[PDB]
């Protein structure tokens, strides 16, 4: 798509994106599930081509507020790939060894190699999101990181990495409903922690942090896509569509090449 791609003009406004927007797809849930199965079959062939050709490196970054759909998006990408060529690198609370080096160290370690597709569940962007919102480093420090990120991603892209960054955009009320469903389910309540409730108060600070991160780092070589994600079906379809179209654009070729006894 083009309406969801954030232009590299530094004029991005998050208020312009409605989490309930479903306008790029004509039809609803059922037609989208059918379109998604078609995309999965296309993705299987494209991922196998990615691997067999062994030249491109594909990085998919997923960022979202908790219950925003990162987990669900990973599952629908995996529905259309060979797990031997695709992996998830997730980024959680940094360890002492990770904090003992620059914040990009643990992230750079996990970049896709040639013929590989890697999904970052959270990423280096957390170092300008939770780090900024919770003041884990002073502003003097984290404000410099927007340039570090643009330049790290420029180097990655110049050296052969195709970068797709998706912000799965849900509303506060949608998050409320999804978090209540987790609490009410005995098989999901383990996902609740001490402080999750008081973190909801920081909703607006996170939205500002996301808007600043996206505006600062959406570039030609590393675009951000804002995905209206209140509807799981639309989020899954749209992310799959963008990923498949991006892979098609690489114009990948099988390597150039008998009766077995």
């Amino acid at each position: 798509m083009k309406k969801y791609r954030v232009q590299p003009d530094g004029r991005f406004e998050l208020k312009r994106f409605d989490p309930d927007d479903t306008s790029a797809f004509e039809g609803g849930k059922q037609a989208a599930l059918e379109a998604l199965a078609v995309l999965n079959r296309r993705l299987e062939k494209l991922q196998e081509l990615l691997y067999a050709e062994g030249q491109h490196k594909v990085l998919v970054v997923l960022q979202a507020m908790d219950a925003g759909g990162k987990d669900g998006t990973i599952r629908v990408v995996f529905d259309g790939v060979n797990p031997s060529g695709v992996r998830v690198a997730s980024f959680g609370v940094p360890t002492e060894q990770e904090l003992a080096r620059d914040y990009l160290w643990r992230v750079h370690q996990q970049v896709p190699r040639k013929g590989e597709l890697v999904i970052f569940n959270r990423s280096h962007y957390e170092d300008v999101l939770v780090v900024r919102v919770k003041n884990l480093v002073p502003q003097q420090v984290w404000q410099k990181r927007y340039r570090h990120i643009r330049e790290f991603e420029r180097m990655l892209a110049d050296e052969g990495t195709t970068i797709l960054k998706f912000f799965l955009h849900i509303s506060k009320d949608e998050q409320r409903q999804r978090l209540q469903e987790r609490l009410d389910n005995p098989e999901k309540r383990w996902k609740f922690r001490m402080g999750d409730l008081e973190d909801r108060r920081l909703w607006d600070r996170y939205q500002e942090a996301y808007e600043a991160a996206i505006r600062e780092t959406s570039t030609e070589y590393a675009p951000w896509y804002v995905i209206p994600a209140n509807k799981n079906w639309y989020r899954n379809w749209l992310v799959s569509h963008i990923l498949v179209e991006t892979l098609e654009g690489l114009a990948m070729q099988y390597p150039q090449p008998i009766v077995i006894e």
Copy 2:
């Protein structure tokens, strides 16, 4: 389904397992696909429990002759899991850095952590398989590795790893048909390399190497399962059944407010 577990008596004979055997399933392909969907739903809940509890470490080892089903088995495992808690560690031709350390170094690095399920696509067993068949090290060296492997796996099991080793067993003629299909498909012919044709001449040497590896290392703490795998549907169902039953046996427990 216990007929496929190799007893730790060192009396295993590969000739006793028919790759065409489908006797553990009282039906065919259609009924097995339905049973497999049920196993996939059970596996999703079990894997999430594995992660949420965060105590067990699960290692699934896949070994098979080329076209034997490792790739297809990985896909049916992933059909029943969350990719955030399961990963594939594949073992290919060792690099100079890997050969500069003991053969278990590159393998030990990839073991599952607590709350994780790892699939080894090939494994430390290649160090008594291709290494043995192609004489990549003298026999004096690779013969000692059966004990190294039993002891490495004993340490893993003692320290909390549940180990499942599957030998996906196909016939020489089944491999021939499957390799011919790869060659004839323009989207799969990239898999073929000249040298595969010479590798076919070594079929019997590999069967002997597999029999000796299985006989030497199938233990109570790290059993081998011989999977008749000429039928993709049977291999998928049986591996999924064993994995789900193993995870059920762990009796995992979930760890021990109105939002405005």
Copy 3:
């Protein structure tokens, strides 16, 4: 000099080794410093041969009670090597990621490669030492680890690693004097941690843990050497002599041009 190698008979008694023993050296500190300088020049040639030949893997394990000499021994090895071919892998308090895998995982990661000498400052032995003494896992668990260690080390040795394990043996009163010296030095008191005082009470439990570990794991392919270490000069000389003699035994040669 072979009186310090613990025979693989499972009959080792730590009481038979006196931390004040200097009997293998017929002289004192000054003559030993000169002998150590000769061993240092020998080690430089042997380490370069190790690297150039690029076939052997050398693992040196250091274990000692705090202030026992691991740090001083590392310096004395480094005085006779090219730092480009020798490295220190130190083992501290396990992290969550390290504890999430078997205790050998973090250790196996660090093994020397061909043409390399690695010094383990502490090692997998801590998993039968501080783990046993502080009951970090039940005895049913840590008792099984003696066999794991023998078998891990057998595999390493079979696959080409020369293993040397040194237990730098100091007395309780020597440790007390050395720890008091750290506290009294403004440039060293940063080493003192809260809990080091209460850990002094566990001295005898550590001595028992060391004896049991050494008795269980000193083998023909992976010997333990008990180093009387109350005298820094004697510990440095003896470790250096054993290391140099071990490397000489490998009969290494420069690759042919």
Copy 4:
């Protein structure tokens, strides 16, 4: 200390540095060996402070033509440190796995952590040196790497790394004598490769590549120091002096906190 620091004005000229220059030291070899022992004793205390304080990260980069002194410089640094807090990360011919990721991947992996001093024996600079000289990638690719390097180093410095880059400067005739000495010594002959002979014909191309890299990447946060290195004694003294003075400038403090029974 100032005459050897390459100013970040992009006007660097390698012809202005004489490999035989010993002007920063009054006296010769013997007085310098004594001054070096004094610097080693100072370095031991400073490195221990670096470790005990556990806050700064120190990166020393060594680049030189073969026989230029990287090996000798490493030994002289190690003469004044505790090996438990200092390590050498050397960069050789990239492996298939290293080439399957961006050239900075293998380098970033090895950066010093808090309280650590790391010496890079060769570095990311090889990706604009041999890579450029032997045309291992097209110019369109390697020309973009000067910016990647400035920006990677900016990020490292902003996030707490003190960076020292030393170009150990030897003349063509000095290299010739040193390489001849290796061939003539039975204990050093093993270092000789046959491609080494034909690599001598590329001397001028390497000098141009070094001048371009120094000019492009000597910045305020990551300076290059050109070390006249025809005299081993002067190279050892000068590198040790710069390192010690840099560590002194960090104003490191021991962490602030009894009769043992």
